[PDB]
């Protein structure tokens, strides 16, 4: 039970924004210029780490 629960929690934490405008990387890269997309992607990367 402990193993299955831990893995499911890890899989489900992927649908969080961490302050960014979206939880999808491709969508952040679209509709934004690089020097602004870098901040959002930084947020996402730190959260998942």
């Amino acid at each position: 039970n402990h193993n299955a629960q831990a893995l499911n929690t890890l899989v489900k934490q992927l649908s969080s924004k961490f302050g960014a405008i979206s939880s999808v990387l491709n969508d952040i890269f679209s509709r934004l210029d690089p020097p602004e997309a870098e901040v959002q992607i930084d947020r996402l990367i730190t959260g998942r780490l």
Partner: protein, 295 residues
């Protein structure tokens, strides 16, 4: 030892946009004879047309072009829905007051933007059009009201405000204000009082069947191969396959537990496809030590 992961690479790229022919009526908006007053601003619906970004840059100088939630450069690579255009005219001093979250006469009594606004604001100076030598008085505004407006609301009612107590009840004497005023636009006031033309475009993205989207060409559709797909601006990489699901008419995408798209409606033939990562792996290498062999 564990070294790396093997990974199949994509073969080709495809694109799938809807087929619409006519251009959008951006002419009627930016080239109107006269603009409406800020207290009775206008709103027009733009739908079912191919948008464009070059024609603006091609016509008269349109400075102060600032957007929220999307960069101005990328507007031609996207696919929209529910596009609306609000146009009006103000003095050149108050153009800073058009932003999400602000204070001042216009923001509180004439035109409020929602705090989560996504869209673009355009403003440019117009003296050869709106200012006349004796001063144009057809452009009015509102100065008095009990409480602030909620986002995207208008008030055309005209009645005497009662600043103090003991309402005067339609005699319009002092201790009572007529809530509407007028701008003086003599072509001599200076930069800080010229009449400026403002247009606000609003829309929302990538969550419903779209009708206004930019100029791009469609490619044929290929199934059962690791490819680079792009459906209405939703880029991705993987394998596509015909589905068994059953979408309701107002749905276009489908999501899974991790909140990642894994089904999509093809916007030319109206069929449902399923998206899957193409390959994964782990590689481990067994060696007897380089002191013994190199095999």
């Amino acid at each position: 030892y564990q070294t790396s992961n093997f990974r199949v690479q994509p073969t080709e790229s495809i694109v799938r946009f809807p087929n619409i022919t006519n251009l959008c009526p951006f002419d009627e908006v930016f080239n109107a004879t006269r603009f409406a007053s800020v207290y009775a601003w206008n709103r027009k619906r733009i739908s079912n047309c191919v948008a464009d970004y070059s024609v603006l840059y091609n016509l008269a100088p349109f400075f102060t072009f600032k957007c929220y939630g999307v960069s101005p450069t990328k507007l031609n690579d996207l696919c929209f829905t529910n596009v609306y255009a609000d146009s009006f005219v103000i003095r050149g001093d108050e153009v800073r007051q058009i932003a999400p979250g602000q204070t001042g006469n216009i923001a509180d009594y004439n035109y409020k933007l929602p705090d989560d606004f996504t869209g673009c604001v355009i403003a440019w100076n117009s003296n050869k059009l709106d200012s006349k030598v004796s001063g144009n008085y057809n452009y009015l505004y509102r100065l008095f009201r009990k409480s602030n407006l909620k986002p995207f609301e208008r008030d055309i009612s005209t009645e005497i405000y009662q600043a103090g107590n003991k309402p005067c009840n339609g005699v319009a004497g002092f201790n009572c204000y007529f809530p509407l005023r007028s701008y003086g636009f003599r072509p001599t006031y200076g930069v800080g009082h010229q009449p400026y033309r403002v247009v606000v475009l609003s829309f929302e993205l990538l969550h419903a069947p779209a009708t206004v989207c930019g100029p791009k060409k469609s490619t044929n559709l290929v199934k059962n191969k690791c490819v680079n797909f792009n459906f209405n601006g939703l880029k991705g990489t993987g394998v596509l396959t015909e589905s068994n699901k059953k979408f309701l008419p107002f749905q276009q995408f489908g999501r899974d537990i991790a909140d990642t798209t894994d089904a999509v409606r093809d916007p030319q033939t109206l069929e449902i496809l399923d998206i899957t990562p193409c390959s994964f792996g782990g590689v481990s290498v067994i060696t007897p030590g380089t002191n013994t062999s190199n095999q």
